[PDB]
Amino acid sequence: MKRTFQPSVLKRNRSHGFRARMATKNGRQVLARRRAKGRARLTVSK
Template sequence: MKRTYKPSKKSKHSTHGFRKRMQRKGGRKVLNARRRRGRHKIAMSTPRKGHYR
């Protein structure tokens, strides 16, 4: 049987990344809440092109 979860940093960034969060009102609320809380990382750090390892 195949596994249902096949982790990929590329797809994770496209759904949970900073730029995706900024596109929607709810995502901006998430970022601001994380800023208020003092989180070191407010979103997944965006990788440079070709650095998805």
Template sequence: MKRTYQPSKVRRARTHGFLVRMKTRGGRAVINARRAKGRKQLSRV
């Protein structure tokens, strides 16, 4: 049986990237929460 996770950098960036996060209010909240926590990496790409 084929594995369910077939990694693709493009697809990952398009769903979890910084630009996608900044598009919505909720996404911006996520970024701000990670900034407040002091995360080294805010989002992928």
């Protein structure tokens, strides 16, 4: 059956990637919480 995760790298990055978190106020606050929690990978880039 066709499950929910149908992967695509270009949609992974355009959607949840770094240049797209940095592109706005609230994604920069996301990166700030991931750095502050101290996190090995911030976004999902590769």
